[PDB]
């Protein structure tokens, strides 16, 4: 009883807001797909990680998760705080209604609301004090710019992408055809992996990046397919599938056609092998290199293949010959794998 | 030339040296001292709490020395600041970096510590007057993730970490006051002294060295682990210090005799520990396993006192309150439990 | 402890043959998987032949592969590694190395130095 009474309803309080947020953190977390990035040496996986309809909404999405947080916020804090302007009173109830909404089509009535309440002395006084409460980390870049998004010809400058961002300097979550993910780079960590590697049992995918011009160098190659038989028969990482890219594909092409370092030296095995059948080589590709390339592909296919569990999967690339993008063959990769999850679950698979 | 081989020569023969100046100490064994003690008997704890705030696995957890609060990091990037009695949620703290191997208590229950992945050491201040707890200090010397951390007071604080080393910080200078080397493999755990004189730390290498804060210098080198030393445990009057392994064996080492007193294993587990602890009296050793569940040994007799059913994936942490009454563990599975 | 002493080893005229034997112990030799590790002049170490702990499961390097035989006596607490044919690009320090964890399947050494469980190995030079 006595004031003793009070605190436990004061507890009980903050518990529930607590309770509250984690409820909104528990949606994006589930919603987000964690990626792990690794790779032997030489592999440039600093450079995958390195590098326009869609981020206007993104942009668009992070505006709004400002401006509903600041409006929120203010009377939630200890002393609330008050609006300078009473005249943005329904304008606040606006936006304490949008916020939490799938899909929004953020209309140009929104804008109005947003930018004029951007603009009253309160809000801003509440911002002010955002380092006490949970805000966004980019939110006056974009409030600031929200006369700029406001245009429907509105084209995002690389400058303003770069806010955009999340994070460890290895950590990386990028927005993908409206799918969350979340990567992490190891290449801050040192080479013994079975402690850290341990990390990610809940990863929906290992991105693993490994040159397919390392058969001669010490055999890189092999050591990479060491690292890999070993990430797959682990027990912690039995259900993580990976994601192979093979890299420095036209260092392997020269090194091929050059001749003077061959791969049936390093994997007399190669001699006996012949391209595969459904074999689709590119434009330009000397049929040499072609089976090369296919002759590592399957040398780190058989290990995928020698579990016969099916509760992970290895989805093998070619990648580094060019640029380009290797995002898109990320997400589809991790679709199927997620596809098959749930078939598996179902014994459909 | 041929200096290395000299060198190498001396070497073994300081191990053989040492060798036997332990294997002289040796007596007797502590089960033959302990064999007329009687026994704990068999005798279980129950879960009188299980506290889920976590959205993801839970990679450790600490005791406030108010006995009361206890914190817990999780790999879903939430620091959970919990209330054992009421089991209601004192503090949420965002992480910069998901992946979080490890947190720490302040003994003022002021400040708390986490680190991971990220190579750094995040502080944070419970006691900001301005508003909710946000980032007060993070300390990155760290080639590493870092393994584990503990406070010696509010100013600096000691931590260990895959990068083979475990370093003295000073939280208001942000750098290290001084730099411990020698492990040969990632340092997975440490456990200061009563008296903040001295601090043990297990390793990736099978060995658990035994290091002096003012000097920061190794004093003495335990070996009797097979496999990788995943945590450690001082024990309550510090003469002493318990050790998990990936072995599937805990070991107890004693300073003054400088050699491991007594293992505890057992012929159906092959799954190694990830955390232990001794309780109040130092009678009993507790310690977590892959297997889920966890076990309580007799710190004296060798034989398991009991077991705690209980978290559907691997036991990740595992404290005993300062005032001994309580034991908690965090799991995989997202769950602390408190034990009795 | 945990030590393994590689043996053996020595100067051998190409084409050769040298028989590479470990001592193994403190711990047990059944659980770990076992393996070879070689590093030659100036260069980081490579994987060269590993050994399950049923003897079943045995694995060589592509080029090592019919020259170098692996076999492990379990009760002796041994490893063995019988290399035939020897050529000069065998040239190398061979340390016998011990997977981390007992009771498993993939392993995580082969780290450049900074690893706990390896000999400090043998010399292996092919003359000339």
């Known amino acids: 009883t006595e004031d003793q009474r009070n605190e436990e309803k004061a507890q009980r309080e903050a518990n529930k807001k607590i309770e509250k947020q984690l409820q909104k953190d528990k949606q994006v977390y589930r919603a987000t797909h964690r990626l792990l990035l690794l790779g032997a040496g030489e592999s440039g996986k600093s450079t995958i990680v390195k590098q326009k309809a869609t981020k206007v909404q993104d942009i668009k999405n992070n505006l709004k998760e400002a401006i509903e947080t600041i409006v929120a916020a203010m009377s939630n804090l200890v002393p609330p705080v008050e609006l300078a302007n009473p005249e943005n009173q329904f304008r606040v109830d606006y936006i304490l209604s949008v916020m939490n909404v799938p899909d929004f089509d953020f209309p140009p009535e929104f804008y109005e609301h947003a930018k004029a309440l951007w603009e009253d002395e309160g809000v801003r006084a509440c911002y002010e004090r955002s380092n006490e409460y949970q805000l966004i980390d980019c939110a006056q870049y974009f409030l600031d710019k929200i006369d700029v998004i406001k245009q429907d010809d509105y084209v995002p400058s690389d400058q303003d992408l770069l806010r955009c961002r999340v994070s460890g300097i290895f950590e990386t979550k990028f927005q993908v055809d409206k799918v969350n993910f979340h990567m992490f780079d190891v290449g801050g960590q040192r080479d013994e992996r079975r402690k850290w590697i341990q990390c990610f049992n809940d990863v929906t995918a290992i991105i693993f990046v490994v040159a397919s011009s390392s058969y001669n160098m010490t055999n890189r190659l092999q050591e990479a397919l060491n690292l890999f038989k070993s990430i797959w028969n682990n027990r912690w990482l039995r259900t993580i599938s990976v994601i192979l890219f093979l890299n420095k594909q036209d260092l392997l092409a020269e090194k091929v056609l050059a001749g003077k370092s061959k791969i049936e030296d390093y994997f007399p095995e190669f001699a006996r092998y012949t391209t595969p059948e459904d074999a689709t080589p590119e434009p330009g590709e000397d049929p040499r290199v072609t089976r090369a390339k296919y002759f590592i592909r399957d040398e780190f296919l058989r290990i995928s293949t020698a579990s016969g569990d099916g509760r992970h999967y290895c989805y093998p690339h070619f990648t580094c010959a060019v640029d380009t993008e290797n995002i898109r063959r990320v997400f589809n990769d991790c679709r199927d794998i997620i596809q098959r999850m749930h078939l598996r679950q179902y014994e459909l698979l | 030339q041929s200096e290395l081989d000299q060198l190498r020569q001396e070497a073994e023969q300081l191990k053989n040296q040492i060798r036997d100046a332990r294997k002289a100490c040796a007596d007797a064994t502590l089960s033959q001292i302990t064999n007329n003690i009687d026994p704990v008997g068999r005798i279980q704890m129950r879960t009188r709490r299980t506290l889920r705030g976590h959205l993801a696995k839970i990679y450790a957890m600490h005791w406030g020395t108010d006995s009361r609060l206890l914190v817990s990091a999780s790999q879903d990037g939430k620091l959970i600041i919990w209330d054992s009695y009421t089991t209601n949620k004192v503090h949420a703290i965002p992480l910069r970096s998901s992946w979080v191997m490890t947190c720490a208590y302040a003994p003022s229950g002021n400040y708390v510590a986490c680190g991971g992945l990220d190579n750094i050491c995040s502080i944070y201040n419970l006691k900001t007057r301005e508003g909710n707890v946000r980032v007060s200090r993070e300390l990155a010397g760290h080639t590493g993730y870092l393994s584990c951390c503990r406070f010696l007071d509010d100013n600096q604080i000691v931590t260990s970490s895959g990068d083979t080393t475990c370093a003295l910080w000073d939280i208001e200078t942000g750098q290290q006051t001084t730099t411990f080397t020698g492990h040969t493999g990632d340092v997975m755990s440490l456990s200061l002294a009563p008296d903040t004189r001295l601090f043990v730390s297990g390793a990736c290498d099978a060995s658990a060295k035994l290091w002096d804060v003012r000097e920061g210098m190794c004093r003495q080198t335990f070996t009797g682990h097979e496999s990788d030393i995943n945590a450690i445990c001082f024990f309550p009057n510090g003469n002493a210090f318990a050790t998990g392994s990936d072995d599937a064996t805990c070991r107890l080492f004693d300073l003054r005799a400088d050699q491991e007193l007594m293992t505890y294993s057992h012929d159906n587990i092959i799954c190694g520990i990830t955390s232990v602890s001794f309780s109040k009296s130092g009678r009993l050793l507790l310690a977590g396993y892959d297997d889920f569940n966890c076990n309580v040994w007799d710190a004296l007799k060798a034989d398991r006192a009991g077991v705690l059913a209980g978290h559907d994936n691997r036991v990740s942490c595992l404290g005993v309150t300062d005032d001994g009454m309580a034991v908690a563990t965090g799991s995989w599975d997202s769950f602390l439990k408190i034990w009795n | 402890q945990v030590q393994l002493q590689e043996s053996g080893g020595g100067l051998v005229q190409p084409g050769g043959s040298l028989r590479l034997s470990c001592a193994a112990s403190?711990?047990?030799?059944?659980?770990?998987?076992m393996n070879w590790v070689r590093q030659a002049p100036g260069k980081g170490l490579e994987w060269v032949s590993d050994i399950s702990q049923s003897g079943a499961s045995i694995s060589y390097t592509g080029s090592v592969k019919g020259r170098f035989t692996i076999s492990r006596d379990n009760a002796k607490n041994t490893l063995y590694l019988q290399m035939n044919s020897l050529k000069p690009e065998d040239t190398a320090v061979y340390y016998c190395?011990?997977?981390?964890?007992?009771?498993?399947?993939?392993?995580?050494?082969?780290?450049?130095?900074?690893?706990?469980?390896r000999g400090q190995g043998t010399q292996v030079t092919v003359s000339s």
């Open positions: 190395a011990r997977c981390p964890a007992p009771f498993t399947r993939d392993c995580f050494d082969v780290t450049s130095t900074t690893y706990a469980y």
């Open positions: 403190g711990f047990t030799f059944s659980n770990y998987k």
